[PDB]
Design an enzyme around this catalytic site. Structure first.
Site, PDB file in Angstrom:
ATOM      1  N   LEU A   1      -6.942  -4.298   8.693  1.00 24.33           N
ATOM      2  CA  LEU A   1      -6.338  -3.007   8.388  1.00 24.33           C
ATOM      3  C   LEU A   1      -4.842  -3.117   8.075  1.00 24.33           C
ATOM      4  O   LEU A   1      -4.057  -3.541   8.924  1.00 24.33           O
ATOM      5  CB  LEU A   1      -6.520  -2.037   9.560  1.00 24.33           C
ATOM      6  CG  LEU A   1      -5.907  -0.641   9.382  1.00 24.33           C
ATOM      7  CD1 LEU A   1      -6.870   0.241   8.585  1.00 24.33           C
ATOM      8  CD2 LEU A   1      -5.640  -0.010  10.752  1.00 24.33           C
TER       9      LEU A   1
ATOM     10  N   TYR B   1       1.185  -0.442   6.304  1.00 26.87           N
ATOM     11  CA  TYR B   1       2.385   0.113   5.684  1.00 26.87           C
ATOM     12  C   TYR B   1       2.140   1.576   5.329  1.00 26.87           C
ATOM     13  O   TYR B   1       1.049   1.950   4.896  1.00 26.87           O
ATOM     14  CB  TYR B   1       2.798  -0.622   4.405  1.00 26.87           C
ATOM     15  CG  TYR B   1       4.036   0.010   3.793  1.00 26.87           C
ATOM     16  CD1 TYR B   1       5.293  -0.150   4.389  1.00 26.87           C
ATOM     17  CD2 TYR B   1       3.940   0.847   2.677  1.00 26.87           C
ATOM     18  CE1 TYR B   1       6.414   0.509   3.899  1.00 26.87           C
ATOM     19  CE2 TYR B   1       5.059   1.515   2.178  1.00 26.87           C
ATOM     20  CZ  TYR B   1       6.290   1.342   2.796  1.00 26.87           C
ATOM     21  OH  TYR B   1       7.395   2.011   2.326  1.00 26.87           O
TER      22      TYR B   1
ATOM     23  N   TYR C   1       8.111  -2.260   8.719  1.00 32.61           N
ATOM     24  CA  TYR C   1       7.299  -1.087   8.394  1.00 32.61           C
ATOM     25  C   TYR C   1       7.689   0.044   9.359  1.00 32.61           C
ATOM     26  O   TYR C   1       7.350   1.211   9.142  1.00 32.61           O
ATOM     27  CB  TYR C   1       5.799  -1.399   8.528  1.00 32.61           C
ATOM     28  CG  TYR C   1       5.251  -2.404   7.531  1.00 32.61           C
ATOM     29  CD1 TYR C   1       3.916  -2.813   7.589  1.00 32.61           C
ATOM     30  CD2 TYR C   1       6.066  -2.962   6.541  1.00 32.61           C
ATOM     31  CE1 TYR C   1       3.407  -3.754   6.692  1.00 32.61           C
ATOM     32  CE2 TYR C   1       5.565  -3.907   5.642  1.00 32.61           C
ATOM     33  CZ  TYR C   1       4.240  -4.298   5.723  1.00 32.61           C
ATOM     34  OH  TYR C   1       3.761  -5.244   4.846  1.00 32.61           O
TER      35      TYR C   1
ATOM     36  N   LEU D   1      -9.435   8.761   8.960  1.00 31.28           N
ATOM     37  CA  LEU D   1     -10.654   8.456   9.711  1.00 31.28           C
ATOM     38  C   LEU D   1     -11.837   8.045   8.840  1.00 31.28           C
ATOM     39  O   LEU D   1     -12.436   6.991   9.058  1.00 31.28           O
ATOM     40  CB  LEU D   1     -11.055   9.663  10.565  1.00 31.28           C
ATOM     41  CG  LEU D   1     -12.440   9.642  11.228  1.00 31.28           C
ATOM     42  CD1 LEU D   1     -12.467   8.625  12.364  1.00 31.28           C
ATOM     43  CD2 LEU D   1     -12.774  11.037  11.753  1.00 31.28           C
TER      44      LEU D   1
HETATM   45  N1  LIG Z   1       3.805  -8.816   2.107  1.00 34.67           N
HETATM   46  C1  LIG Z   1       4.021  -7.930   1.128  1.00 34.67           C
HETATM   47  O1  LIG Z   1       4.879  -8.097   0.261  1.00 34.67           O
HETATM   48  C2  LIG Z   1       3.173  -6.701   1.104  1.00 34.67           C
HETATM   49  C3  LIG Z   1       2.179  -6.475   2.082  1.00 34.67           C
HETATM   50  N2  LIG Z   1       1.399  -5.332   2.031  1.00 34.67           N
HETATM   51  C4  LIG Z   1       0.364  -5.200   3.113  1.00 34.67           C
HETATM   52  O2  LIG Z   1      -0.860  -5.026   2.443  1.00 34.67           O
HETATM   53  C5  LIG Z   1      -1.516  -3.810   2.858  1.00 34.67           C
HETATM   54  C6  LIG Z   1      -2.236  -3.324   1.641  1.00 34.67           C
HETATM   55  O3  LIG Z   1      -2.165  -1.924   1.533  1.00 34.67           O
HETATM   56  P1  LIG Z   1      -1.219  -1.073   0.583  1.00 34.67           P
HETATM   57  O4  LIG Z   1      -0.293  -1.921  -0.237  1.00 34.67           O
HETATM   58  O5  LIG Z   1      -0.604  -0.024   1.406  1.00 34.67           O
HETATM   59  O6  LIG Z   1      -2.196  -0.390  -0.451  1.00 34.67           O
HETATM   60  P2  LIG Z   1      -3.786  -0.281  -0.585  1.00 34.67           P
HETATM   61  O7  LIG Z   1      -4.142  -0.694  -1.968  1.00 34.67           O
HETATM   62  O8  LIG Z   1      -4.399  -0.993   0.554  1.00 34.67           O
HETATM   63  O9  LIG Z   1      -4.067   1.342  -0.403  1.00 34.67           O
HETATM   64  C7  LIG Z   1      -3.249   2.375  -1.011  1.00 34.67           C
HETATM   65  C8  LIG Z   1      -3.847   3.787  -0.746  1.00 34.67           C
HETATM   66  O10 LIG Z   1      -5.288   3.713  -0.679  1.00 34.67           O
HETATM   67  C9  LIG Z   1      -5.754   4.837   0.033  1.00 34.67           C
HETATM   68  N3  LIG Z   1      -7.148   4.544   0.389  1.00 34.67           N
HETATM   69  C10 LIG Z   1      -7.620   3.727   1.398  1.00 34.67           C
HETATM   70  N4  LIG Z   1      -8.939   3.672   1.441  1.00 34.67           N
HETATM   71  C11 LIG Z   1      -9.345   4.484   0.424  1.00 34.67           C
HETATM   72  C12 LIG Z   1     -10.650   4.868  -0.077  1.00 34.67           C
HETATM   73  N5  LIG Z   1     -11.770   4.403   0.473  1.00 34.67           N
HETATM   74  N6  LIG Z   1     -10.704   5.744  -1.158  1.00 34.67           N
HETATM   75  C13 LIG Z   1      -9.547   6.231  -1.737  1.00 34.67           C
HETATM   76  N7  LIG Z   1      -8.264   5.923  -1.338  1.00 34.67           N
HETATM   77  C14 LIG Z   1      -8.245   5.041  -0.243  1.00 34.67           C
HETATM   78  C15 LIG Z   1      -4.754   5.085   1.137  1.00 34.67           C
HETATM   79  O11 LIG Z   1      -4.664   6.467   1.446  1.00 34.67           O
HETATM   80  P3  LIG Z   1      -5.072   7.051   2.927  1.00 34.67           P
HETATM   81  O12 LIG Z   1      -4.203   6.353   3.951  1.00 34.67           O
HETATM   82  O13 LIG Z   1      -4.834   8.538   2.765  1.00 34.67           O
HETATM   83  O14 LIG Z   1      -6.529   6.723   3.110  1.00 34.67           O
HETATM   84  C16 LIG Z   1      -3.463   4.433   0.579  1.00 34.67           C
HETATM   85  O15 LIG Z   1      -2.406   5.352   0.373  1.00 34.67           O
HETATM   86  C17 LIG Z   1      -0.342  -2.945   3.396  1.00 34.67           C
HETATM   87  O16 LIG Z   1      -0.693  -1.831   4.196  1.00 34.67           O
HETATM   88  C18 LIG Z   1       0.541  -3.997   4.051  1.00 34.67           C
HETATM   89  O17 LIG Z   1       0.083  -4.202   5.379  1.00 34.67           O
HETATM   90  C19 LIG Z   1       1.587  -4.351   0.981  1.00 34.67           C
HETATM   91  C20 LIG Z   1       2.565  -4.550   0.004  1.00 34.67           C
HETATM   92  C21 LIG Z   1       3.365  -5.719   0.052  1.00 34.67           C
END
Ligand SMILES: NC(=O)C1=CN([C@@H]2O[C@H](COP(=O)(O)OP(=O)(O)OC[C@H]3O[C@@H](n4cnc5c(N)ncnc54)[C@H](OP(=O)(O)O)[C@@H]3O)[C@@H](O)[C@H]2O)C=CC1
Length: 325
Positions: free
Chosen positions: A22, A25, A57, A276
């Site tokens: 999970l 960010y 974060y 959720l």
């Molecule tokens: N080391 C680095 O440079 C980086 C690391 N990361 C890491 O990688 C993780 C990857 O996630 P992230 O970059 O945030 O983006 P993601 O591609 O994982 O997700 C982006 C959006 O997807 C939504 N989402 C999740 N599940 C669903 C679904 N089933 N249907 C529709 N929308 C959905 C979320 O909204 P909602 O919450 O409303 O469900 C969220 O806002 C990060 O959280 C972080 O821990 C990210 C960027 C850079």
């Protein structure tokens, strides 16, 4: 070979990592306190055994609260949980590496982290300020020395503060600098980079496989698409016609298709969700598989366009995205 109850793949140092975790960010200004803690607890109840976070974060303490509470409840044992933490750009100075990790250990209230990685290959000016900029708004950098920083990291493993070491946002040249380092003690076991159907990372993945480095795909669903920083020029990944059509073949969503795609190729995925329903949805990717043909159909969607470019730092000597890979 990959079920809800058992889905850990080997790391070159002898440890293992749950193929899905999970992500945590979330934009501070608009994320209610406790959302992260609540989400992590839901993930654990659902079956997740891997959580990806970072001190910058600003919610790392919430991850600790959820993990500790679930251990207190007896739902899991510490060894069942895999947590990844990250060393920020402003902490590349060797003597600052251990103190930075220890601070995260105090934040989590845990004895060690399963995986600690260098967040970016670019060194920024040392300090408490995460995004240092001078009076004229110019970015305050620092001369990078990845081999020196890596040695400090290795000492952290020798002291038992972290199980496995890795990197994030490293290109081939940067990985090789570490790999060919004289007296190398602990090889990087993982490289966390952006990866999904619109940016499949074919050459970097092939390179990492050759050196037994496992790739963790961040932004596996294509990011939150926050205009404030996301390259909105590329169309929304989850609205992709082919991915949606493929979803109807197994009564799965586009999100579930893209997650299955990467895990099936041996790529770790860390989708983020504080909802959720979606948290649960993203975990339902072990009751079906994609055919060889479908994997090729999804791979052909590669546009070689990053949603996360980090253009503001393209002038840094170690900016990782100038090279082909
Ligand atoms: N080391 C680095 O440079 C980086 C690391 N990361 C890491 O990688 C993780 C990857 O996630 P992230 O970059 O945030 O983006 P993601 O591609 O994982 O997700 C982006 C959006 O997807 C939504 N989402 C999740 N599940 C669903 C679904 N089933 N249907 C529709 N929308 C959905 C979320 O909204 P909602 O919450 O409303 O469900 C969220 O806002 C990060 O959280 C972080 O821990 C990210 C960027 C850079």
């Amino acid at each position: 070979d990959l079920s809800a109850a058992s889905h850990r793949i080997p790391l070159s140092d002898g440890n293992s990592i749950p193929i899905i975790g999970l992500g945590t960010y979330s934009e501070p200004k608009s994320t209610p306190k406790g959302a992260c803690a609540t989400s992590v607890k839901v993930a654990i109840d659902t079956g997740y055994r891997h959580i990806d976070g970072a001190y910058i974060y600003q919610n790392e303490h919430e991850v600790g609260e959820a993990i500790r509470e679930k251990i207190a409840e007896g739902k899991v044992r510490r060894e069942d949980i895999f947590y990844c933490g990250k060393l920020w750009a402003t902490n590349h100075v060797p003597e600052m590496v251990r103190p930075t990790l220890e601070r995260t250990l105090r934040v989590l209230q845990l004895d060690y982290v399963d995986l600690y990685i260098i967040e970016v290959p670019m060194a920024f000016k040392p300090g408490d300020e995460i995004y240092p900029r001078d009076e004229n708004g110019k970015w305050l950098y620092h001369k990078s020395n990845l081999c020196a920083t890596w040695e400090a990291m290795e000492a952290c493993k020798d002291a038992g503060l972290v199980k496995s070491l890795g990197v994030s946002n490293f290109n081939r040249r940067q990985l090789e600098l570490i790999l060919n380092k004289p007296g190398l003690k602990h090889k990087p076991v993982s490289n966390q980079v952006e990866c999904h159907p619109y940016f499949t990372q074919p050459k970097l993945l092939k390179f990492c496989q050759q050196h037994d480095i496992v790739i963790t795909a961040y932004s596996p669903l294509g990011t939150s698409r926050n205009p404030i920083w996301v390259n909105v020029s590329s169309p929304p990944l989850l609205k992709d016609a082919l991915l949606n059509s493929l979803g109807k073949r197994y009564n799965k969503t586009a999100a579930q298709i893209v997650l299955r795609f990467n895990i099936q190729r041996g790529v770790v995925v860390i989708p983020k969700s504080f909802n959720l329903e979606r948290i649960k949805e993203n975990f339902q990717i072990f009751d079906f598989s994609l055919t060889e043909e479908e994997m090729k159909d999804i791979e052909a969607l590669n546009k070689n366009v990053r949603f996360v470019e980090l253009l503001m730092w393209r002038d840094h000597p170690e900016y990782p995205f100038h090279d082909e890979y």
